[PDB]
Amino acid sequence: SLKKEYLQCQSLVDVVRLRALHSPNKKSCTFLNKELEETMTYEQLDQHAKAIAATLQAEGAKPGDRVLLLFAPGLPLIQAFLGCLYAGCIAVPIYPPAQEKLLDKAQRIVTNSKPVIVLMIADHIKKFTANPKFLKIPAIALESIELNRSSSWQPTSIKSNDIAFLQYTSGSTMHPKGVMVSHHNLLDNLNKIFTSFHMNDETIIFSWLPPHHDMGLIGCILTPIYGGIQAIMMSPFSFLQNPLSWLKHITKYKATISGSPNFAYDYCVKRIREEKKEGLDLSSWVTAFNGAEPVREETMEHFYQAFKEFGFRKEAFYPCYGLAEATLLVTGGTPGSSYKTLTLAKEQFQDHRVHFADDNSPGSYKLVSSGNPIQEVKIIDPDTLIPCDFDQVGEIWVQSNSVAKGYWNQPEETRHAFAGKIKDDAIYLRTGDLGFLHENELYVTGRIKDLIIIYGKNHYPQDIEFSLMHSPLHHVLGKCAAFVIQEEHEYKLTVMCEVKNRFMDDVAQDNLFNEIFELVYENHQLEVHTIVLIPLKAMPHTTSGKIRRNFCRKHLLDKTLPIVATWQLNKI
Numbered sequence: 001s002l003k004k005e006y007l008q009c010q011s012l013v014d015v016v017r018l019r020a021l022h023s024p025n026k027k028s029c030t031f032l033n034k035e036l037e038e039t040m041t042y043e044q045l046d047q048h049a050k051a052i053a054a055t056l057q058a059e060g061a062k063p064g065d066r067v068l069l070l071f072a073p074g075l076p077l078i079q080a081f082l083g084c085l086y087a088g089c090i091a092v093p094i095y096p097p098a099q100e101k102l103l104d105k106a107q108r109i110v111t112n113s114k115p116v117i118v119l120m121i122a123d124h125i126k127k128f129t130a131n132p133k134f135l136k137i138p139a140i141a142l143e144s145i146e147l148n149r150s151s152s153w154q155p156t157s158i159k160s161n162d163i164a165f166l167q168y169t170s171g172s173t174m175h176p177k178g179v180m181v182s183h184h185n186l187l188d189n190l191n192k193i194f195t196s197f198h199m200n201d202e203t204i205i206f207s208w209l210p211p212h213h214d215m216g217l218i219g220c221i222l223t224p225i226y227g228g229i230q231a232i233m234m235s236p237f238s239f240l241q242n243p244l245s246w247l248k249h250i251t252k253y254k255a256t257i258s259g260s261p262n263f264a265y266d267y268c269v270k271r272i273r274e275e276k277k278e279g280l281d282l283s284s285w286v287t288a289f290n291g292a293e294p295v296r297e298e299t300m301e302h303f304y305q306a307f308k309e310f311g312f313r314k315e316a317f318y319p320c321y322g323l324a325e326a327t328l329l330v331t332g333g334t335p336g337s338s339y340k341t342l343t344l345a346k347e348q349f350q351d352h353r354v355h356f357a358d359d360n361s362p363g364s365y366k367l368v369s370s371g372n373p374i375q376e377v378k379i380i381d382p383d384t385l386i387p388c389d390f391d392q393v394g395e396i397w398v399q400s401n402s403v404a405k406g407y408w409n410q411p412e413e414t415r416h417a418f419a420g421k422i423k424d425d426a427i428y429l430r431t432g433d434l435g436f437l438h439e440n441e442l443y444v445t446g447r448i449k450d451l452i453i454i455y456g457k458n459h460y461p462q463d464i465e466f467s468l469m470h471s472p473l474h475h476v477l478g479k480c481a482a483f484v485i486q487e488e489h490e491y492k493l494t495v496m497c498e499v500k501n502r503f504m505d506d507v508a509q510d511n512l513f514n515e516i517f518e519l520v521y522e523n524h525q526l527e528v529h530t531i532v533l534i535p536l537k538a539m540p541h542t543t544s545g546k547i548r549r550n551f552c553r554k555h556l557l558d559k560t561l562p563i564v565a566t567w568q569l570n571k572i
């Protein structure tokens with residue numbers, strides 16, 4: 001980031017070490033649970049990392065070995081992650097395998113990455129193991145690690161191109177893809193983030209984002225640690241239970257940067273009653289980033305109208321685009337500036353070119369700019385491999401020192417994504433994303449592959465239905481079905497449930513809708529957009545999820561079936 005001595009460091013390990021010498025008592029990370037606060041300084045973070053690394057070394061872990069990190073959000077996850085890096089080990093973070101699908105995912109990650117050790121908290125060695133082992137991997141409770149081991153740490157010779165950690169992406173549920181992020185990849189992107197976000201020493205980051213997804217890890221934890229900036233955090237569970245707490249904490253801690261995928265702004269609008277806004281002051285919040293999924297004008301306008309009386313300014317909104325394969329940040333605008341939009345015509349014909357329309361012409365729709373290329377971005381036709389003109393839709397191809405090394409132990413998939421070559425032309429990351437450049441700003445339009453097809457091959461509908469049927473929620477329900485609907489230019493994950501009691505009162509309905517949203521988010525890392533409640537026995541008898549699902553999809557579309565209530569995330 002800023003000071004030259006830090007720019008010169010060759011890994012995040014040395015950045016943390018040096019910060020701990022220059023400013024041992026500077027607050028780094030704060031984690032919040034309810035009204036409880038725990039903070040660690042740079043001196044502490046460095047000492048914990050050394051202690052953990054010395055333990056890994058004492059237990060036979062070698063540079064390049066993978067160490068699985070099984071943690072809920074919190075300071076222990078962050079200590080363990082740095083501790084892995086200090087040992088030259090490849091960190092492999094995973095969500096605690098609390099339910100069936102999360103456990104299946106963990107097993108597939110273990111099989112792929114073949115870690116030598118797993119770290120987790122003492123409580124979890126009891127919950128997830130029978131020398132304790134988790135899925136045959138020797139396990140170690142982080143609490144067993146004492147600070148008197150710190151001085152035993154032996155520095156390794158970390159090279160730029162060495163892999164620092166694996167970040168597993170969503171999708172590919174059947175063969176999870178572990179993106180190999182090198183030490184050089186990581187520092188390159190951290191610098192791009194610090195710079196592009198105009199961070200400085202007033203900056204304070206707040207995050208509730210999953211630390212097991214790139215944005216919440218690389219953006220909201222590793223960047224602040226790298227840049228000497230406070231990270232103030234809570235768990236996604238805390239956010240979903242009480243989204244107001246996000247805005248309360250931003251208020252209390254005068255956070256300047258905080259953000260999320262687009263849905264979370266709608267979730268705030270939907271969940272926070274006018275009277276509960278009393279006490280907010282969001283004037284400090286100058287960069288409200290919006291990335292990881294399609295960015296919606298309507299969402300941001302709703303949020304702006306809902307919070308403007310409490311100091312929130314629409315200019316704070318900062319659309320951005322990226323993916324794990326490029327470490328994180330690929331495009332973004334200028335902080336404090338108004339993001340741009342374009343209005344496309346209903347009819348886009350077949351030329352792959354963008355067809356524009358007057359600012360509210362019939363059937364027109366708006367796309368939000370994801371900002372300027374920060375990594376090099378080319379729009380390339382995915383079939384012919386010929387570059388697209390501006391205002392012509394093609395695949396988003398990326399190149400820079402932030403582009404990752406491949407997928408762990410998946411050589412064919414790695415060639416499929418990281419070896420893009422332009423017809424008659426460098427090597428590019430092929431994102432699978434479609435979009436276009438207009439006046440040097442990137443407009444993301446969709447995915448090459450049909451999202452309904454993707455949901456299907458990942459077994460999302462069947463697995464979401466399983467979750468509902470196996471949660472305590474099933475006690476007030478009959479049968480259920482989950483599916484994705486494409487509905488003018490957007491995709492909406494839709495859940496339909498029979499309810500035993502068709503007179504379910506408005507409060508119970510609201511609670512039920514929220515419980516459903518939380519369940520799917522936790523079990524599947526997906527966001528439900530629409531929930532429909534219908535009477536018992538309203539779905540025909542069948543032993544087939546597919547038949548049941550097709551019936552619900554078809555009769556939602558008909559507008560025939562009896563409906564008890566509907567919930568729409570993005571509607572007021």
Ligand SMILES: CCCCCCCCCCCC(=O)OP(=O)(O)OC[C@H]1O[C@@H](n2cnc3c(N)ncnc32)[C@H](O)[C@@H]1O
Pocket residue numbers: 169170193197205213214215219220223257289290291292293294295319320321322323324325328329330370431433444
């Ligand atoms: C200090 C904070 C700085 C944080 C800077 C954060 C910058 C945003 C980086 C998000 C990292 C990413 O989401 O990871 P992942 O690999 O799981 O999935 C990536 C996929 O998601 C999609 N997608 C992300 N953006 C999108 C956008 N704008 N429009 C539409 N589709 C977007 C794409 O399809 C993409 O391929």
